């Protein structure tokens, strides 16, 4: 599916460009930058905020940059993750 | 029962919840109780006022987030359209 | 719009239950029993929980009652506000 | 331009993260900028590390909420069909 994986694809992108700027600008770890960029992006939220005006910035176009593809990306993957059981209990 | 899809998401459902409640208990030192609070809050995106503090726990939570959303909120959806709705329609008929 | 009638109702019923239930077990003022109901069930989220497990235990099955139901109310509440704008934009 | 209520839905979420950065800035004193972050973060559901202190930003929060998502959500699935997607198709066209 090309679907799936474009919406793959994108949306790695967008964790590493939020990653990356997040360990760079924000002097977060690596592991930390990904977990800010993740828990944004889904709407879980975090306990912690940037302390710079440029990452206070950069956050709120990350926001609606990546809100819309990440969950289309949770969307396809939820149908590719549960088919499998679906079609174990139909077919 | 008559809806196999939503059965099939009720049971992905729990046994994610279980999961979490096994894996936050045991990784990151939580109560239970506390761990599956942590992981429902977390699965519905509402967020809890707490964090993981081991790298473990944020690699784990960061997959358990992308493959658990989509899960809790389509048994969310199939528990709305197929009992919720239902329900208040019964209940607001004339008898 | 009896649908929009009713989803309000219901709403503010949820509400004044979450309102009630942790003003009393979770021992917060009204206001704030009512600030942590209405960021649990629209998923902005909380940055307290409850102390007790009786708390949590309600706030897991509290989430899964009210969630469909405050986002079906928050969806006709967005199309009665914005639509005056939309038909003066219009019409 | 084109489409209609995608313009009304823009200018709306922008008047309403206006009036979010005045409140917050007034009331719970924040920079402006860290006003304007608390406003978006909320009505997206991210949510922030901080809240409202006072009973006035608390209510006014609830209000902000219910309000809010409705129209910024329905900004963002806009943005989405109407500018990203477009834009990521183009953008996949061999030339
Ligand atoms: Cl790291
Ligand atoms: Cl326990
Ligand atoms: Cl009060
Ligand atoms: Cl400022
Ligand atoms: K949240
Ligand atoms: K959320
Ligand atoms: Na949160
Ligand atoms: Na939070
Ligand atoms: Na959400
Ligand atoms: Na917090």
């Known amino acids: 599916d090309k679907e799936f994986?474009?919406?793959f694809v994108l949306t790695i992108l967008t964790l590493?460009?939020?990653?990356i700027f997040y360990?760079?600008?924000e002097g977060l770890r690596p592991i930390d930058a990904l977990y800010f960029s993740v828990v944004t992006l889904?709407?879980?939220?975090?306990?912690?905020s940037p302390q710079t005006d440029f990452g206070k910035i950069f956050?709120?176009?990350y926001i609606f940059i990546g809100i819309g593809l990440v969950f289309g990306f949770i969307h396809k993957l939820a149908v590719n993750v549960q088919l499998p059981s679906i079609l174990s209990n139909l077919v």
Do not use: R
């Open 59 to 61: 956050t709120i176009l």
């Open 23 to 25: 360990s760079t600008v």
């Open 5 to 7: 994986q474009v919406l």
């Open 42 to 48: 889904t709407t879980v939220g975090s306990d912690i």
């Open 16 to 19: 590493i460009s939020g990653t």
